[PDB]
Amino acid sequence: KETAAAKFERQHMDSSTSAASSSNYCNQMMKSRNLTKDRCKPVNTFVHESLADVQAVCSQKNVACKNGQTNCYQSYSTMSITDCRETGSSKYPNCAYKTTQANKHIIVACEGNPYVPVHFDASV
Ligand SMILES: [Cl-]
């Protein structure tokens, strides 16, 4: 079974680019991060910062998570992110995503020792 921290890395980290450079970014990344294997994951955000910078959020601003848990943290800085969401043309096995690039604060839930991100809650 994949660890929670490793699942977060796979689903949400893309430190190899500064930003989505095209409309096809999400189609490509959703496929390659194995988020379309058996069904199309409906919504998923990638963060274009170093892993260290995203881990560091777990010692930044403590805020409520949407679900009411208290282990969420909001980045002090905005970060380069890309939201990927299925479009109306999407139909497994031919998933199709809209790519929306933005610079926003991220909110992550953190757990463990080391205390690291395990869920992507939202951007602001
Ligand atoms: Cl997400």
How far is residue 93 from each of residues 31, 38, 45, 59, 89, measured CA to CA in Å?
Answer: 11, 8, 21, 40, 12
- Tell me: is residue 103 an annotated ligand-binding position: no
Method: X-ray
Q: Which two tokens stand for residue 29?
A: 């990344």
- Tell me: is residue 42 an annotated ligand-binding position: yes
* Ramachandran area for residue 68 (φ above 0: left; ψ -120 to 50: alpha; else beta): left
Residues with a catalytic annotation lie at: 12, 119
CATH code of the domain in which 76 resides: 3.10.130.10
Distance 4 CA to ligand 1 centre (A): 14
Number of separate domains in the chain? 1
Question: Of 108, 116, 102, nearest to 48 (Cα)?
Answer: 102
For residue 75, the enclosing domain spans: 1-124
- Tell me: is residue 39 an annotated ligand-binding position: no
The helix, strand and coil proportions of the chain, stated in percent and rounded to the nearest 5, come to 20, 35, 45
What single-letter DSSP state applies at residue 59?
G
- Residues counted in the chain: 124
Q: Half-sphere exposure of residue 46, counting CA atoms within 13 Å on the CB side?
A: 26
How far is residue 94 from each of residues 62, 68, 69, 121, measured CA to CA in Å?
Answer: 39, 35, 35, 27
Q: In what order do the strands lie in the sheet with 72-74?
A: 61-63, 72-74, 106-111, 116-123
